[PDB]
Design a protein around this ligand. Structure first.
Ligand SMILES: CNC(=O)c1nn(C)c2c1C(C)(C)Cc1cnc(Nc3ccc(N4CCN(C)CC4)cc3)nc1-2
Length: 295
């Protein structure tokens, strides 16, 4: 990748896909390629900004094609070059590899224009982080068990295919109707056994599995991250980025000032998920087999 001819070469949208229909031309009611506005500008009603960061922005939109609501994630600035472009496009690939699942945020379509990547997904509710902020307290365990089960279902789906999300956290879990949720943000997702060697994009340090400090990547890392995710939302407990507390949470410590009110059942499951040794840590499939996590 770091050596292509025409390294610097950079107008109308091109579909990004699983090599099915695409590579392809896009069309839409409201879109005329000879007008200078982008496909995104012409083909959607932009309703609000749902999120933003160094990556770009996510908008709530209404599609002019079907009049339905979606989210569109748009990258910040034109591709830096071939490696940046490949890195960003790989998020679409990760969706293709994951495939559709009721506990994963669904990708509807993706395209690039003018060096910008656009991912149009289903519109979900707020993140679990945002939900906890609105609640202003610990979530009732009845809510927690549902979110735990749904995100475990998502992880089992990824893990069965040798995929690791690597950034499981409340901010990347989105609420659905009637108590469900979905795992999203596949930007850091990796397929084990494929380079880059030291497949090095790092998730949020608050939720990182301890074995990742020595580069031991595996599906078990996601189970640990989800354990801390659920601990945080069930206890309204801020997680340390580092220091003594960060180490203790990775040595089996459950702070009594925060966790004394957990049911024995939920505590028991969290201990399984937070096991420091990834070889001993429960798998998502194994957790989902526990009667307490049944349908
Ligand atoms: C890197 N970022 C993302 O992947 C990402 N961020 N958001 C906010 C979304 C994504 C996805 C996973 C790519 C797609 C998506 C799909 N749906 C939502 N829904 C949503 C709804 C409401 C809100 N809020 C409403 C109240 N507000 C003050 C803003 C937060 C945030 C997100 N968010 C998103």
């Amino acid at each position: 990748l770091g050596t292509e001819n025409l390294y610097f070469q950079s107008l109308q949208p091109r579909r990004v896909s699983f090599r099915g229909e695409a590579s392809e031309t896009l069309q839409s009611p409201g879109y005329d390629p000879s007008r200078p506005e982008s496909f995104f500008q012409q083909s959607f009603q932009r309703l609000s900004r749902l999120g933003h960061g160094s990556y770009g922005e996510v908008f709530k939109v209404r599609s002019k094609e079907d009049g339905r609501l979606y989210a569109v994630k748009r990258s910040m600035s034109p591709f830096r070059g071939p490696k940046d472009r490949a890195r960003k496009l790989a998020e679409v690939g990760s969706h293709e590899k994951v495939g559709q699942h009721p506990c994963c945020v669904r990708l509807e379509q993706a395209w690039e224009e003018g060096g910008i990547l656009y991912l149009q997904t289903e519109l979900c509710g707020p993140s679990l982080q945002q939900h906890c902020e609105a609640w202003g307290a610990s979530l009732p365990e009845a809510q927690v068990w549902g979110y735990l089960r749904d995100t475990l279902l998502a992880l089992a789906h990824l893990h069965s295919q040798g995929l690791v999300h690597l950034d499981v956290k409340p901010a990347n879990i989105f609420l659905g109707p009637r108590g469900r949720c979905k795992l999203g943000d596949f930007g850091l997702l990796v397929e084990l056994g494929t380079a880059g060697a030291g497949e090095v994009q790092e998730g949020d340090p608050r939720y990182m599995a301890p074995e990742l400090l020595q580069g031991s990547y595996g599906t078990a890392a996601d189970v640990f991250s989800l354990g801390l995710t659920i601990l945080e939302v069930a206890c309204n407990m801020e997680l340390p980025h580092g220091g003594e507390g960060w180490q203790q949470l990775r040595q089996g410590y459950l702070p009594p000032e925060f966790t004394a009110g957990l049911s024995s059942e939920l505590r028991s499951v969290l201990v399984m998920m937070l096991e420091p040794d990834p070889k001993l840590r429960a798998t998502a499939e194994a957790l989902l087999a526990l009667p307490v996590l049944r349908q």
